[PDB]
Amino acid sequence: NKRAPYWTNTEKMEKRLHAVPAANTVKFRCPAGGNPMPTMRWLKNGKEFKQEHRIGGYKVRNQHWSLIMESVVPSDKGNYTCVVENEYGSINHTYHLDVVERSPHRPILQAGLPANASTVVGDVEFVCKVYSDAQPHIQWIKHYLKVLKAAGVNTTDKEIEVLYIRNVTFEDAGEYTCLAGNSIGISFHSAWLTV
Amino acid sequence: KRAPYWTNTEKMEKRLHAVPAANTVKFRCPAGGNPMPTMRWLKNGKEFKQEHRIGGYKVRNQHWSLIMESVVPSDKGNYTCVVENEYGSINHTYHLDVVERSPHRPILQAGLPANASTVVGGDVEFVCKVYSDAQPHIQWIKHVYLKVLKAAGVNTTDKEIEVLYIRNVTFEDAGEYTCLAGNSIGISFHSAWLTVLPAP
Amino acid sequence: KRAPYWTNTEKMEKRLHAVPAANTVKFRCPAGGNPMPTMRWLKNGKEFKQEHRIGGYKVRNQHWSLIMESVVPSDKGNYTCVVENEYGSINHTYHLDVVERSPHRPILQAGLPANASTVVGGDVEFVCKVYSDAQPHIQWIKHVPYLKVLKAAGVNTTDKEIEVLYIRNVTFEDAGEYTCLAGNSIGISFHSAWLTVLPAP
Amino acid sequence: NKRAPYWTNTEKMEKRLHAVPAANTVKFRCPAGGNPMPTMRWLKNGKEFKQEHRIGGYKVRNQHWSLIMESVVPSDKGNYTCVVENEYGSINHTYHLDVVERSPHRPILQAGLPANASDVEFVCKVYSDAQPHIQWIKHVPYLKVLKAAGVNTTDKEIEVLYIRNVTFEDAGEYTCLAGNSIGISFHSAWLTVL
Amino acid sequence: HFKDPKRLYCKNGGFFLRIHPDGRVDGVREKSDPHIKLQLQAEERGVVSIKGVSANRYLAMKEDGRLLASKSVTDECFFFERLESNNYNTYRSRKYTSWYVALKRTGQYKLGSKTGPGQKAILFLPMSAK
Amino acid sequence: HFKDPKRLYCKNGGFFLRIHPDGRVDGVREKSDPHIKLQLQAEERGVVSIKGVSANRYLAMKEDGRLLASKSVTDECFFFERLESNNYNTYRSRKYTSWYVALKRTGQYKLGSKTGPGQKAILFLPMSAK
Amino acid sequence: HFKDPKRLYCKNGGFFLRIHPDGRVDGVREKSDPHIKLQLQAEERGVVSIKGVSANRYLAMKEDGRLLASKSVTDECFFFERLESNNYNTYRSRKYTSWYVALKRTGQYKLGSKTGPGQKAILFLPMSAK
Amino acid sequence: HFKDPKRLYCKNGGFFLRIHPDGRVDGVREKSDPHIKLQLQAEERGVVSIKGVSANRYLAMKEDGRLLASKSVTDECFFFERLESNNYNTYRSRKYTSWYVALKRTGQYKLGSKTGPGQKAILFLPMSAK
């Protein structure tokens, strides 16, 4: 029988937001039926999507009613719409794409921090700056090691990157270390306190 | 009373220090002498100043060491320690090299291989472009259930592994072709389709 | 004087005959009639000939039966009996299916599970590959003979993922002999592998 | 204290021929001592034994001086030699492996035999791992044993039944019946006397 | 492959064991029926549970010997599986150790209390679910 | 920035992990929902606690494999965080070391006891809380 | 082929059952020995007699559990033959129904009275007589 | 570019892996040496062969743990390549799965049998062949 276009598998279309890690392949599908066989067109942000719109362009497999984009990058973020039509009708569906860059490195600390410090008999601080994708665990150590402070539920990341030492004694002199670790590995920078 | 002298040559034998970017580097020149000798560090034969690099550097006189954190390619060069007192002056030189590592699975160029079409009896090719730090292993697969058409190795070098040629094609050759690249970290693959049409 | 008729429909109610390979199969169509009706057997709607199978077949007119000895998978099909005389013709069809049985204890793939080595804090896996006719029961055991059951098949631990054992963030205590053990009503089979845990830097 | 390699348990090495049923695991051992600790290598038919030499390869546990082969098959038959050495000596020992396939099925008869007949004979062809017991029966269910295997009626001629100078009384159904500990099988034929 | 679903064919009459969505148990000859596709799973050596894929219920034998399919697994859903010398399978209740899962020549199940080791009603042949 | 709150997107179905004020745990697709803004915090190397900012509760996995959010921190509130080779994150219970935090295609959580390393239900992508 | 002569290999020590011309019974490892070629013959279902071809004598088990080979067949010359689940064969006296034909690690037979179903001394593997 | 030849620098002492024309293997500090230019090639995922361009030979590890370079490729010429968390590479024998390619502080190779996962002698950094 002759009929307008219709989706043949809404299950595979329910996931509207496609958030994926950079460098992966993305595939959008809009399985359709209809008689005569409906045509398919894909739009990017409501406008014709052309091969030159991204490095390496894209691929379309009419047999699977799909749009394929390989090695996605941040700039691919946007809306992708499939339009399907024949003489008896026209229907569309929209997907949203978001790309997230992942960094599989151990934590990285800013060079120069913490910095050496010199005092007398009454305050000082040691600062540290950490960067990491995988959640990092930060702690401050005094050199045989002694843990002065460590991140956790009771000592949030908000104030873990700065170590304060008031009314210093000659005993406080020594090497202080900011140590940061995640599942991949450990990093640490040290400074000296002169009293 | 005596001129400066190295107290531990063992720790100074490694002259070339090649390390991965982002690591901390430490050079040492343990010395002795009476009176206690002073120490100075040079970069490429000239005074090494804090402003010579992002974040500068740190020196621990007690350990006769020079420390540079989070090294980068621009840190490559020569680092010399000069130690002296009234009875003498001696020096030692270290060479630093930094290498950036990429702990990712192989990455392929978008769009390759590309779909291809031809009439029975024609010739065709599929191109692939791979990038990887860890040595990658490349092979071409036909979806039949898979069938390996060609794979890298001692007898099939990487020089020509990225291009797959298929001559005098039959209708049987039609189908999905995949370039698959893998290393110790993971696997990546891009696919293309070959369409074979009738032949007048 | 009368057309052919079945003298015992009870013995003809079982239409589908599924039997294990190597068994003898017998189809019957007890009939009556005057004059005595003749009998012919068809395989898949066509004349069934002796050369149609290894060893052919046997027919006992007195019992209105068709006999096939030592059946094999290729004997699968339809077998029809046609009975007739001057006043009529009637038929009945049987469907035959053959299933090969394996009365062996579970068999495991050689080489699996494989020995594994790692540094303290690493991750590891042990794979096992089982084959069995009679439903097999699979479990993973650690030798601590003092044994400790790490995982066992059941309603709460389906066969879909029972053949692979994962162990993450290993300690030196995890080192030792691991065994995949498979058993059915007939017997038990098992393959073992060793886990070596080395010190960290 | 320093010495060449030597066997620490010859008892476990006396059994040279290892004949085992297919699908079982086999383990060869050559417990050794020596100072320094000797190394161990295994050969198959006098040549290096490699993992690719059999499906699934093999396993070696240096701590037990053993070679392990799982799920053996007929093709594994051959000689396996252990070579143990250090700077003061080298010694070896050889094992022979043989694999036998077992068949846990009841007796199987050839289709078509015996065959209907119209002097006469009935032939039967039997196959079985477990020793089978064969007998010929006449249907007179009222049965009559015509002949049966045993010490006085060997298997050599038990598979053929001869009937000479037949009478109309001999007509009927004849059955060759074979049984072992697992089960029974039987094929029948008819004798027509005109 | 032991992990694959199966149909259990009964030598008695040639019916496929069927487990209805509402929990009733009987036999049918139509190989196309969606309620004869079963999934066997071993709980321990030689003991299995039999689940109707469609009905999403487990076969069980009650104290009076009646057969039914439960939504949740109980101690009446486990059976000793045995490959008999005749090469057919039998399923014996682990709870009521003398009764067998069986079907009558009519196509209706047979009370476990009326079953025995030599009966034709307790013999099943596992077959592919196509 | 690791100290900033995040949304945890599940590859299975594309639902954002949600922690309700009353402690119920499920997934939803509406990026605007105020109960999907989470705060991760490392307790030790590679181990984190996940807290719903709005609900002011901590994600936890019970002995039966069920997920819920607790007012106060317990040993069932810590998970091994791992960046997989596929570039997605997984969260494995430090207490019940074989179960993973996961969501079903329906949007309801998945029993930790039914999870496995190769499943699509355990893969999450950390995203900015806008 | 069941009618062909065979060697009976004992798993215990790897000795071939041997029947001497003078009626003595023991085991030996030399596959070339002419007195290990045996002829099995079923007397009834699952019951066999074992005859040494060279010695022209029949294996037998006496009342005290001793093994010997007789010139003529007696009721002590018949044994139940069984293929065990481990795929080895066992031979149990039809007269003294609890004793098994067996060999000791030394190569000497083992008193039937000292045998049991789980012992390694009662396991034999039938092999071709080349 | 992975297809380009490389020098393999050993963290232990800072020597470049060298493959001599006659098949001897050691390390040297002179970046100018023509026998440190190597060509890596994957045989299968994560497994490589290492060939000295000048010597036209392949690196190999013998049964006793000694290193040498072969004219023709054998099963002792393949090594698992791994990028460690410390960002250095390691090469483990695919045949003798516990031994690593390594150099001693002296500049002489180190017996594979004396290597271990935490040693400084097994850490290499691939560098450009200029």
3-state SS class at D90: strand
- Shortest distance, CA B183 to any CA of chain H (angstroms): 5
Length of chain B: 200
Distance, in Å, from the CA atom of G49 to the CA atom of D154, rounded to the nearest integer, reads 11
Tell me how crowded residue F62 is: count the other CB atoms within 10 A of its CB.
16
- Identify whether residues B35 and B106 lie together within a single domain: no
Instruction: Give the other-Cβ count within 10 Å of E103's Cβ.
Output: 30
Is H75 close to D41, i.e. CB distance below 8 A? no
Q: State the residue range of the domain holding A79.
A: 1-101
B184 CB neighbours in chain F (<8 A) are none
Residue by residue, DSSP assigns B74-135 as GG-EEEEEEEEETTEEEEEEEEEEEE-------EE-TT-SPPEEEETT--EEEE--EE-SSP
Which positions in chain C touch F117 (Cβ < 8 Å)?
A: 166
Is C23 inside a domain boundary?
yes
Q: Are residues A165 and A78 in the same domain?
A: no
Are A85 and A6 spatial neighbours (Cβ–Cβ below 8 Å)?
Answer: no
Residue found under tokens 């992002």: B54
Closest CA to H94 of H82, H79, H81: H79
Rounded Cα distance between C34 and D150, Å, is 50
d(CA E104, CA E81): 20
Tell me the domain boundaries of chain H.
1-130
Residue burial A11-39, b: 16+ Cβ < 10 Å; e: rest: eeeebebbbbbebbbbebbbbbebeeebe
B190 CB near a chain A CB, below 8 Å?
yes
Type and span of the H or E element at B165: strand B163-166
d(C-alpha C107, C-alpha A38), whole Å: 53
Q: Is C201 in the H-facing interface, judged by CB distances under 8 Å? A: yes
Q: What residues in F contact B186, CB-CB < 8 Å?
A: 85-86
Q: How many domains does chain C divide into? A: 2
Q: Which phi and psi (to 5°) does residue G68 adopt?
A: -160, 170
Contacts of C46 (CB under 8 A, 6+ apart): none
Q: Which of C53, C58, C110 sits opposite D71 (nearest CB)?
A: C110
Contacts of C185 in chain E (CB under 8 A): 45-46, 80-83
Q: Are A91 and A106 members of one domain?
A: no
Chains contacting chain A through 3 or more C-beta pairs under 8 A: B, F, H
Closest CA to B162 of B127, B197, B133: B127
Chain F contact residues (CB < 8 Å to C) = 80, 92, 97-98, 113, 116-117
Task: Give one DSSP letter per residue of F94-124, joined into a string.
Answer: SSSTT-B--B-TTSBB--GGG--TT-STT-E
Give the number of other CB atoms < 10 A from CB of residue A135: 27
The gap from C-alpha E59 to its chain's centroid, in whole angstroms, comes to 7
Q: Which of residues 108-147 of B touch H (CB under 8 A)?
A: 130-138
DSSP B50: G
How many Å is the Cα radius of gyration of chain C?
29
Q: Which of G82, G83, G84, G85 to mutate to test the interface with C (most CBs of C within 10 A)?
A: G85
Beta carbons of F113 and C156 less than 8 Å apart: yes
Would you give the DSSP letter of residue D51? G
C-alpha to C-alpha distance for A145 and A147, rounded to whole angstroms: 7
The tokens describing F26, both together, are 């499920």
Measured between CB atoms, does D61 come within 8 Å of chain H?
Answer: no
Chain breaks in chain B (C to N over 2.5 A) after: 144
Chains interfacing with D (3 or more CB pairs < 8 Å): C, E, G, H
Supply the Cα-derived Rg of chain D in whole angstroms: 28
Which of the other chains make 3 or more beta carbon contacts under 8 angstroms with chain C? D, E, F, G, H
Touching status, chains B and C (3+ beta-carbon pairs under 8 Å): no
d(C-alpha H82, C-alpha H78), whole Å? 13
Whether G and E touch (3+ CB pairs < 8 Å), yes or no: no
CATH classification at residue B31: 2.60.40.10
Among D69, D101, D133, give the residue marking a domain's end: D101
Q: Do A21 and A55 fall within a single domain?
A: yes
Rounded to a whole number of angstroms, the CA Rg of chain F reads: 13
- A3 with A95, same domain: the answer is yes
Q: Which of F32, F99, F14, F12 is closest to F59 using CA atoms? A: F99
Listed residues D39, D73, D101: the one ending a domain: D101
D40 and D51 part of one domain:
yes
- Cβ distance of E42 and C137 shorter than 8 Å: yes
Instruction: Report the DSSP beta bridge partners of residue D121.
Output: D162
Q: For this experimental structure, what is the resolution in angstroms?
A: 2.2
Query: What residues of G are in contact with residue C105 (Cβ under 8 Å)?
Result: 85
- Tell me the C-alpha distance between H102 and H17, whole Å: 9
Instruction: Report whether H12 belongs to an annotated binding site.
Output: yes
Query: A89 — contact with chain B (CB < 8 Å)?
Result: no
C137 contacts in chain E (CB < 8 Å): 42-47
Paired residues of F45 in beta bridges: none
What chain E residue is nearest to C102 in terms of C-alpha separation? E87
Six-digit token string for E7:
């149909």
User: How far apart (Å, rounded) are the C-alpha atoms in residues C135 and D13?
Assistant: 39
3-state secondary structure H78-107: CEEEEECCCCCEEEEECCCCCCECCECCCC
Q: DSSP of G18-83, one letter per residue?
A: EE-TTS-EEEE--TT-TT--EEEEEEETTEEEEEETTTTEEEEE-TTS-EEEESS--TTS-EEEEE
Residue H97 C-alpha from the chain's centroid:
15
CATH 3.40.50.1000 for domain F1-130 = no
Residue G60: Cβ-neighbour burial (10 angstroms; 0-12, 13-18, 19+) = buried
